[PDB]
Design a protein around this ligand. Structure first.
Ligand SMILES: CNCC[C@@H](Oc1ccc(C(F)(F)F)cc1)c1ccccc1
Ligand SMILES: CC(C)C[C@H](N)C(=O)O
Ligand code: NA
Ligand code: NA
Length: 498
């Protein structure tokens, strides 16, 4: 089995897995919609009671599987629980990252396309201070790129440029993945993470120097880091925070598990796991939180920035921020550095959610790396045409896989590892080879607090929160993908028989 060459390259590959579009795009929008600092308390508690323990569980399950030659959950679940239902439940750890990949790689492709155009200066020109006259050209710029419907039909029409950039983005993902774990993912991470970090720091400094009659960047930081204890009674904030924690740390995606299955059976996962998780949180609360919101607040004030963050999820990052930047000398270039940052952040993450399917084909169906990567790219590429051409298909996939799926799957992998396999075996498996030991309090968190936390959350979700007819096209398609992956698991157990 392939293994990570260096401890550092492992940390950075895992950090790269976690540090992505979620830190710079999803987090600020989530924090601004939910009272800024009112969001941060549940977010921290979620990190301590959900984020940390599940990260340790997923590293453990991964290393455990990999030692027996299996990198994915259909098989790993079966090792921990010798039951046919374990294999079926394990299909979600191929389904979730695959469905997520289908839309995530497309959003990643936008950032590349915007980087190219912002570098070459093919950008909208606002007139030489009326906000709507400055924002609109950048709105139209995004709308033409992705092809937002102009009438009644729920159909998108991406520009020719957007389509070819998607193709290039796929080609780039493939070229990294085809070289494997040490020479591909690890090598790229060593280049990509330092670049990503430097670009983000530069932008944070640049944003910190912004001031208008409407405000400063520091008003954005005060909005984000000032608690509201009255909001702590609102369950919506808690549901939002926990969802962000999952998405941001790549928990419940089978992506951490798979990367961990290339950690040698002896090697530490406790300190490594905690460091990768902590690097992500820095890049999210310090770097990601410091760019978009403070810049929006400076130029528009708090209440306008909140309203912008509620307008959509891509309004802030693809419209508002580059619009703001265009009002400053060297702004088109500053736009380029932002989108380049986003591209590298997306790229290190999307290779993490394509690798589970690659690992399944190699481990269970015995395809070569080349064939496994090429077929995985073909399924993502083909499937992506749904997200590219059907309005709100992205939202449907992001809901079922990226939102509901991950929490369900997190609770499931915890029940399988810590309740069925055995709480004492699991704990032994986590700490085995550890540089540091996991605090004793976390045994009771993992066994009782985390699962009760998530079960209560999911109860309120499917009873107090659960559209156009076209959402059924996407549901149909992704259900079919699940059935298809079930077929492959079936074929894998048959190959093992013969
Ligand atoms: C609860 N979250 C809001 C839904 C939001 O989803 C996403 C938000 C951000 C990302 C990103 F991080 F960019 F990858 C991916 C998906 C979304 C999806 C499609 C359109 C608009 C918003
Ligand atoms: C799907 C995951 C790889 C997403 C990643 N953790 C992010 O925050 O962008
Ligand atoms: Na993240
Ligand atoms: Na990343």
């Amino acid at each position: 089995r392939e293994h990570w060459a260096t401890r550092l390259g492992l940390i950075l590959a895992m950090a790269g897995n976690a540090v992505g579009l979620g830190n710079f795009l999803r987090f600020p929008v989530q924090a601004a919609e939910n009272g800024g600092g009112a969001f941060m308390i549940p977010y921290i508690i979620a990190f301590l009671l959900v984020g940390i323990p599940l990260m340790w569980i997923e590293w453990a399950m991964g290393r455990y599987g990999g030692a027996q030659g299996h990198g994915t959950t259909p098989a790993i679940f079966y090792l921990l629980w010798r039951n046919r239902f374990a294999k079926i439940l394990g299909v979600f750890g191929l389904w979730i990252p695959l469905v997520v990949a289908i839309y995530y790689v497309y959003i990643e492709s936008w950032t590349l396309g915007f980087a190219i155009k912002f570098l070459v200066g093919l950008v909208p020109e606002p007139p030489p201070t009326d906000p709507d006259s400055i924002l609109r050209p950048f709105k139209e710029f995004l709308y033409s790129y992705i092809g937002v419907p102009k009438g009644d039909e729920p159909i998108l029409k991406p520009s020719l440029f957007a389509y070819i950039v998607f193709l290039i983005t796929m080609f780039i993902n493939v070229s990294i993945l085809i070289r494997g774990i040490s020479k591909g993912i690890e090598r790229f991470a060593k280049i990509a993470m330092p670049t990503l970090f430097i670009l983000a720091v530069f932008l944070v400094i640049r944003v910190f120097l912004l001031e208008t009659p409407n405000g400063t960047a520091a008003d954005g930081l005060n909005f984000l880091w000032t608690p509201d204890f009255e909001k702590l009674k609102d369950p919506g904030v808690w549901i939002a925070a926990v969802g962000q924690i999952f998405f941001t740390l790549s928990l419940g995606f089978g992506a951490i598990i798979t990367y961990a299955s290339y950690v040698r059976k002896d090697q530490d996962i406790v300190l490594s796991g905690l460091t990768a998780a902590t690097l992500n949180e820095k890049a999210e609360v310090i770097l990601g939180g410091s760019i978009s919101i403070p810049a929006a607040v400076a130029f528009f004030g708090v209440a306008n920035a909140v309203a912008i963050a509620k307008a959509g999820a891509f309004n802030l990052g693809f419209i508002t921020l580059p619009a703001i930047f265009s009002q400053t000398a060297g702004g088109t270039f500053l736009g380029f550095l932002w989108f380049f940052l986003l591209f590298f952040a997306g790229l290190t993450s999307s290779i993490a959610i394509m690798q589970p399917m690659i690992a399944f084909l190699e481990d269970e169906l015995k395809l070569s790396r080349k064939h496994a990567v090429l077929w995985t790219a073909a399924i993502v590429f083909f499937s992506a045409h749904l997200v590219m051409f059907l309005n709100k298909s992205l939202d449907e996939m992001d809901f079922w896989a990226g939102t509901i799926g991950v929490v369900f799957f997190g609770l499931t992998e915890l029940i399988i590892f810590f309740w069925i396999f055995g709480a004492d075996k699991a704990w032994e498996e986590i700490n085995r080879g550890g540089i540091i030991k996991v605090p004793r309090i976390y045994y009771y968190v993992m066994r009782y607090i985390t699962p009760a936390f998530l079960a209560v959350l999911l109860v309120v979700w499917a009873r107090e929160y659960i559209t156009h007819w076209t959402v059924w096209i996407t549901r149909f398609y992704i259900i079919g993908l699940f059935l298809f992956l079930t077929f492959l698991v079936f074929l894998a157990e048959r190959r093992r028989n013969h």
